[PDB]
Design a protein around this ligand. Structure first.
Ligand SMILES: [Zn+2]
Ligand SMILES: [Zn+2]
Ligand SMILES: [Zn+2]
Ligand SMILES: [Zn+2]
Lengths: 90, 78, 94, 104, 97, 253, 90, 87, 104, 96
DNA sequence: AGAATCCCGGTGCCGAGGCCGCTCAATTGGTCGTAGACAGCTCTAGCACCGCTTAAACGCACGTACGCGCTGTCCCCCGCGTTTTAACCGCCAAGGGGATTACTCCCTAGTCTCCAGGCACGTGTCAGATATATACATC
DNA sequence: GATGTATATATCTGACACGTGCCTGGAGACTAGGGAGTAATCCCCTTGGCGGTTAAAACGCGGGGGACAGCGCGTACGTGCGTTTAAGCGGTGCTAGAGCTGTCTACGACCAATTGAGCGGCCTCGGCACCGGGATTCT
């Protein structure tokens, strides 16, 4: 019963769901492999974080469809791979 | 270092997407997917920055990086 | 100044003539600025491509009609074109 | 009087003219080109704002916020086809739960 | 007929002509049996008038419409039949007394 | 009576043509759509503004949107002149141009009074109906069961209470007798598919009365009024039809 | 038997839809925009090639969806899912 | 004007064997009998989108013939690129 | 000499230059622009043809056919990303049967 | 009465022989390669044009083309394309 | 032993591979303008740091809604053979639209002059966010 | 009955609606020139219809593999609880580089003049398609 309460509560909101600081750390750890001594505008990090969450949320919406298609409720590694492949090749 | 994206953080994203149940194995896969996405966007964003001979990645560089991948953002001045 | 100009002043005017009871938050305005520039580029983009595809150098209202019908889905184009032709007609007569 | 005034438009026809020329979309831009375009840009702006307005009323608000712009886009199928590749900042998602996940 | 009635009878007759005035071109000279309308600008067509708006479009107006935007309005079909029926009914009553 | 009925009927027919699903009078604010029939701006916008998802056209099987609609223009012009003709009509024949459409101008009463007046001239397609006598918002009807039903040959009596916003919002449809059916309450309340998310001005007294017998033909156990019956229909289906038939023979009315 | 058929159809480069009935379909649709509209014979070929490529790509995705559901036979439901993820009708 | 237009259910020109072969190329082992109806539906919509644009380009050029170039541009507009018919 | 000769390229540096200006991509085109571009077009062309040629040899053919151009692409991850959205006329498909469809 | 389209078919032949001296290419296959060249050309010219606007420049130079390639080509394909590009320009510029 | 995938040798089809002759577009060299490269300075917005705050995340134990595999029964799909349709080849003619030239003159580019519509900035109201107490609608 | 969601209010902390003064792009009015608009020629190639051959689609039947509906078992999550964890907030202080301004010069648009690398069509073989028979899969 809780999952349904949470789905409604989160869909009604707009805030970013990933904690901002640890997200920024991830960005920096990736960025260093392209160029050293890079700096980021604080708004740039937000832009990137927002794009990232939007990507994953959309992916989860499609993944969920794949899961119910298979007549299951729980999201499996198999379901994300399928949804990702069909989308990935478009 | 990718562990910065906590299990609850993933769950929250999944809930917004309308997921009722999550297999515990998805968290490791999800992080993998995210890692790849960011690598692709950042690679492009850095390239734009280098082109302009700047050492700062601006919001506009992230936006352009995303426009090229078919994911346009609004609200960042692009 | 060198800071890029936006359409926030025009978005206000449009809203007031449509839904006068409400205002626009600054973040919402930012979204609208991207929207206008996004659509602007798409239409201008197609108008450019058409000029090349049809071996022409000048863009006129005719090329734009084509560009709009190609970009706007469903019935949206029908209304958009109507407004376009009316504006041109009035402009021409003025 | 301005071109926008003559055309009965709110959008800056004079600016559109400049943008089309500077943007190098073509070697030349016709007199009726920016007029027609401004009308289209204004029309689409009006469509999205009208819907955003109604969204504000639904939430008993008198000010448009990013969420309202997205709810307007997402509920209208036509706009979804046009802006299906666009993410609105702080737009969240359009509420939706599939029947298979609900109580019986 | 009485001073107020006879005025009204003449009005109703004139009104019919004004109702029909709505369907006109250089050739749509009268009320049409099978009028074709174009969405977005009206400009109702004769029975052999729509063929030209299909080929080229409206004269001067030239609305860039598809051939799917052209159709006969059923509401006109019915209203038109009634306006003809009324014309005759009004005239006969005026003649009779 | 110098052929005044014929003049009256042709003029009244003009109004009949230019009349929406809600209004039973000449449309004063007409708008055109993709399909061939005119609606009021106010009436159609209210329908489209309901949270029912995409709406279907009340006068045909096609759909409707706020977009694609345009000033009826020609028809707006017809309305103005037709009103001027009515002015003359009162002097030409001196007759009414409405079937007792003299109720309250808000439409709350005029609409229900006018529909009942028309009902008397043109009753429901497959049944009889008229007023109860308590108010103009309380109607009765007698309906016989269609062949494609466990209720075949049975006859039920209705007592329907209409709201002031009828037919924009659904009426309180009720039977005076309890019927063994998933959608029928022991207190007589009836839950039709058409009385909730599918309710619209599209539905007239004839259509509503027909819909009730249609539901008897094919019950809907999803969110029932009487779960104690709905469970049987949903699971066994045939068991329900047999019991309903036996019940009908004694309690149909 | 079907497996041999798959190998042969994947290997060949031939058009799988008969040319004449395809051209008829194109005209049947095209006439709804303009009357008396002509086509270059090459234009129809180009369209048919794109058309077959489109459907084959869709079938490849459809097949994967059915496999995911632990089925071999593809259903209309699987086509709809593939289109829903691709975003053709969403 | 003067067009002997033919209005028919020409979608039926795409028969079971044709769809079956396409599905086989896609690696499908078994096909439900309901697929044939669904597939035709999908194809029609796809073609409508491509043709609509190809015609639109032709109209712009004030031509009465849809050329290979117009089909190719239409496909690019739809986000799909075809090689071998254009230049 | 020619410009392509000086660069040591097979592609027409001179025509690349003309296209950059004719296509109105920018108000001005730098002298080193068409040379660099020509080199890239050549490189990519060589990569596809080399692989297509290899496909032809495997099938015991001497002349390249559209199917070989496509197979070379389908068998190359770098090219699948580059030309993933491209359809090659009469290319057919890359052979593929899933294990779940086979006898056990 | 002159062609206004031209093609790269003559250059494709030359490149083909350098890689596979004993092979040939059909006219249909040539149509594919010709289109390919124009497709890539447009993509590179397209990104270079966008870079000019995004960086407030009115001239496309070898720098923009280089960047455009890094954006358009994946992985190691880009790595080689850039190398071939810089080599051709260096030789050309020094005229050696 | 049966039926479908290749190979081997042979003729012949028509595709492409090389060369003739011509001329648009490539190449060269010179003039002048300015857009870009560079140097040089201000002070904006970002980096790293500290300490306190408290909502978020970690880890654990209970027990049960779901996932997984197995059995059994239904039907509707695939393979086969036979009949019927109309897909396709090759041929014929008419004739409608495409691509081409050659002249016209109307529309847009570029030039300066001069002005008020939008920009940055600051002031003062007030619209939404948080938290409390109010009663119902769910679970 | 026992929790949790919308209701109406007080409070107040930033952000929005408006107004002021500046100047930078807009509009006004004129010349020059070249883009595309019209008329008129004539050459493909599109449409339509003719028949005949015969490959592909359509019908009906056999019967068997896969779909899927129900059963029962096991455990991988979901729910709550309690204990730390570092994420978020505010404030401080340093300084690297983003952006503004001004100067000067490689180098790019543009023109006119020379000429040859590729275009377009024709002559000559040689790589594939496909016939007809054989052996190797391969079920
Ligand atoms: Zn007419
Ligand atoms: Zn018109
Ligand atoms: Zn009404
Ligand atoms: Zn309708």
């Amino acid at each position: 019963t809780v999952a349904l309460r949470e789905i409604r509560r989160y869909q009604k909101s707009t805030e970013l769901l990933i904690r901002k600081l640890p997200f920024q750390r991830l960005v920096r750890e990736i960025a260093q492999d392209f160029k050293t001594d890079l700096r980021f505008q604080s708004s740039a990090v937000m832009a990137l974080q927002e794009a990232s969450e939007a990507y994953l949320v959309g992916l989860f919406e499609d993944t969920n469809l794949a899961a119910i298609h298979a007549k299951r409720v729980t999201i499996m590694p198999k379901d994300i791979q399928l949804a990702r492949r069909i989308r990935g090749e478009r | 270092n990718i562990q910065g994206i906590t299990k609850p953080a993933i769950r929250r994203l999944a809930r917004r997407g309308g997921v009722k149940r999550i297999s515990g194995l998805i968290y490791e896969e999800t992080r993998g997917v995210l890692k790849v996405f960011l690598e692709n966007v950042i690679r492009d964003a850095v390239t734009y920055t280098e082109h302009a001979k700047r050492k700062t990645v601006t919001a506009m560089d992230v936006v352009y990086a995303l426009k090229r991948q078919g994911r346009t953002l609004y609200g960042f001045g692009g | 100044r060198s800071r890029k100009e936006s359409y926030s002043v025009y978005v206000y005017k449009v809203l007031k003539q449509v839904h006068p009871d409400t205002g626009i938050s600054s973040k919402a305005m930012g979204i609208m600025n991207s929207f206008v520039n996004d659509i602007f580029e798409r239409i201008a983009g197609e108008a450019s491509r058409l000029a090349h595809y049809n071996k022409r150098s000048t863009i006129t209202s005719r090329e734009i009609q084509t560009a709009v019908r190609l970009l706007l889905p469903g019935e949206l184009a029908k209304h958009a074109v109507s407004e376009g032709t009316k504006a041109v007609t009035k402009y021409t007569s003025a | 009087k301005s071109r926008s005034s003559r055309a009965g438009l709110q959008f800056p026809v004079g600016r559109v003219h400049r943008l089309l020329r500077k943007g190098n979309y073509a070697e030349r831009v016709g007199a009726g080109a920016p007029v027609y375009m401004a009308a289209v840009l204004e029309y689409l702006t009006a469509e999205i704002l009208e819907l955003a307005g109604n969204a504000a009323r639904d939430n008993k608000k008198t000010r448009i916020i990013p969420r309202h712009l997205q709810l307007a886009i997402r509920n209208d199928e036509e706009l979804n086809k046009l802006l299906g590749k666009v993410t609105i900042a702080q737009g969240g998602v359009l509420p939706n739960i599939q029947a298979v996940l609900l109580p019986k | 007929m009485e001073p107020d009635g006879r005025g009204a009878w003449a009005h109703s007759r004139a009104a019919l002509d004004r109702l029909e005035k709505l369907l006109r071109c250089s050739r749509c000279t009268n009320i049409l049996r099978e009028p074709v309308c174009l969405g977005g600008c009206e400009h109702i067509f004769c029975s052999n008038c729509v063929s030209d708006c299909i080929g080229t479009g409206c004269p001067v107006c030239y609305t860039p419409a598809w051939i799917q935007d052209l159709k006969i309005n059923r509401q006109l079909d019915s209203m038109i039949q009634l306006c003809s029926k009324l014309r005759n009914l009004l005239h006969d009553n005026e003649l009779s007394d | 009576a110098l052929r005044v009925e014929e003049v009256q009927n042709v003029i009244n027919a003009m109004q009949k043509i230019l009349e929406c699903p809600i209004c039973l009078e000449l449309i004063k604010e007409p708008v055109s759509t993709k399909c061939d029939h005119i609606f009021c701006k106010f009436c159609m916008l209210k329908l489209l503004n309901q949270k029912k998802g995409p709406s279907q056209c009340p006068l045909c099987k096609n759909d409707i949107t706020k977009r694609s609609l345009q000033e009826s223009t020609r028809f707006s012009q017809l309305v103005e002149e037709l009103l001027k003709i009515i002015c003359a009509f009162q002097l030409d024949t001196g007759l009414e141009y409405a079937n007792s459409g003299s109720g309250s101008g808000s439409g709350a009463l005029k609409r229900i009074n006018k529909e009942l007046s028309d009902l008397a001239r043109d009753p429901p397609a497959q049944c009889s109906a008229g007023p109860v006598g308590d108010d103009m918002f309380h109607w009765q009807a007698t309906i016989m069961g269609p062949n494609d039903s466990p209720y075949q040959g049975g006859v039920f009596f209705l007592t329907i209470h209409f709201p002031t916003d009828y037919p924009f919002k659904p009426p309180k449809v009720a039977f005076t007798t309890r019927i063994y059916h998933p959608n029928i309450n022991s207190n007589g309340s009836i839950k039709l598919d058409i009385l909730r998310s599918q309710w619209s001005p599209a539905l007239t007294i004839s259509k509503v009365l027909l819909s009730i017998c249609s539901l008897l033909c094919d019950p809907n156990p999803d969110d029932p009024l009487v779960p104690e019956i709905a469970r049987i229909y949903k699971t066994d289906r045939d068991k329900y039809n047999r019991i309903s038939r036996e019940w009908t023979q004694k309690y149909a009315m």
